[PDB]
Symmetry: D2
């Protein structure tokens, strides 16, 4: 996931409301880095929220990873840090969301003169209308993400049946 | 605030977060309420959730919730603490036996100076004087002045409001 | 040390490091020697080299060399300062006209508190009272108490040992 | 330069003497990430040292980049941070050096559950004896660097003539 240049710093969702963002989200499109991916965001007894990521492996098994998400600076609640089990902390930015349909999430780490980027369009449903996807690919283009490089997540009902 | 950079003392080897859960009482701390307790719990995510309580001078219970996460899992004794409306601070478990005492350390660099927090805690409202002496020994080894240590008031009657 | 987290004030737009080089005199600063000057020079690497001088109460000149680097080149006004035997500290040029004044800021988080340094500097040993007032205005906007500001002694005779 | 797992933390050169490390170094072998590469380390009026990297581009031109290197914690003088022009800071660790012949340098950045690594065997001469290279590849193996993945730098006198 490596491109030349430093991390861009795109705009994040204004007035981000973590409470409305909780619940289940489905991956629709992502940069290259399992299928049927969902994230579930929950109340945390501490600060931030707890994260449950699930995906189907090519062999039919469900991989799952638990994590925590915390906005370090509370004045920018849309810029989080994600802590996964046995992973180092990674940035997680909610660039744009309506809370009820779509979200666009971004994550970038500097590597000298290069950077590694993760980006993802997610939805409250296993699908998202083509018009919305287009809008969000527009946003991604504005800070240099190549639309060609985007993979479509397989969210087929039958293939993803093992996710209950 | 003392001159010099943060020391980097040794941390508890093979630190077991599961055994560290539950209630701890402050026995001694560096200057920075009384009757202080911390309660560490299971977190649905990674790390554990923290509930700190203390009695204010006016009799009210102040409480703050937080989260503690070991950023590098290969050093599970070096945590980051995230409190509500606070910036993240380091939290190192230097030494613990899980059932009696712990010694916790936290230090932040300020140029040529540093700010340090240190605390002896216990599973009971009191801790034997021998154990305290041992742990003050450990603190001395990396430059903490034993004179500067305050004793936490854990008197049963004074602390009755903590149920 | 004040309660609350570090503010993040605006920095000088289109900051030109080349024009900022040369000698600056401390006029006012928050509490943390007198006759203080900083001298900024070309660095063969990136950023610039720093030579701070001050007069100690006993008449001796203390001096410390350092390096200043903008980690993110897209924000050239937000530097890191590296002094000998010190940990790195932030250094923000909030406002400067390059030929008369500058206002510099530095803040480090300590949990629910923070430690702040702020300084009004000048190209001359003095600065007009009007300019000082303007810059104190800027400081007030992000919560610096104007009362707490110390005036640096830049008296020609007292500072004669600085050549 | 991306492998799974977190950054290893190998041992660094004990009692590292920055003064002896100054001068000219030639790249002999490196992980994938120009040829004829040299680094020149110099006195810095501030703290740390100044860096001048040079290499030959495939078209015959000399690319050069200036930088600064600083040990943030002076108690670990072998763990530096490198600041290049228009680059974000990267770690630079001197794992092993004799100051007069060879050095082995390492640099690794975490990317969640993965990491990106740079490693380099350098020499005071355009070549280094095969025995020494073997020793240093041994050290690299101990913390999981695949010896197969190592590229040999072209330091041919004639091809590198443009470097004066």
């Amino acid at each position: 996931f490596i491109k030349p240049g430093r991390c861009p710093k795109p705009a994040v969702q204004e007035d981000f409301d973590a409470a409305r963002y909780l619940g289940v989200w489905y991956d629709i499109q992502r940069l290259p880095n399992g299928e049927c991916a969902t994230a579930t965001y929950s109340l945390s007894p501490g600060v931030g929220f707890s994260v449950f990521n699930r995906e189907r492996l090519a062999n039919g098994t469900i991989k799952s990873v638990i994590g925590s998400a915390i906005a370090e600076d509370p004045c920018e609640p849309a810029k989080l840090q994600f802590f996964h089990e046995n992973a180092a902390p990674v940035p997680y930015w909610v660039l744009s969301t309506d809370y009820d349909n779509y979200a666009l999430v971004y994550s970038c780490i500097n590597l000298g003169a290069s950077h590694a980027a993760y980006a993802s369009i997610v939805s409250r449903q296993p699908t998202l209308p083509e018009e919305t996807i287009k809008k969000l690919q527009g946003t991604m283009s504005s800070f240099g993400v190549g639309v060609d490089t985007l993979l479509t997540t397989n969210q087929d009902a039958a293939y993803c049946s093992a996710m209950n």
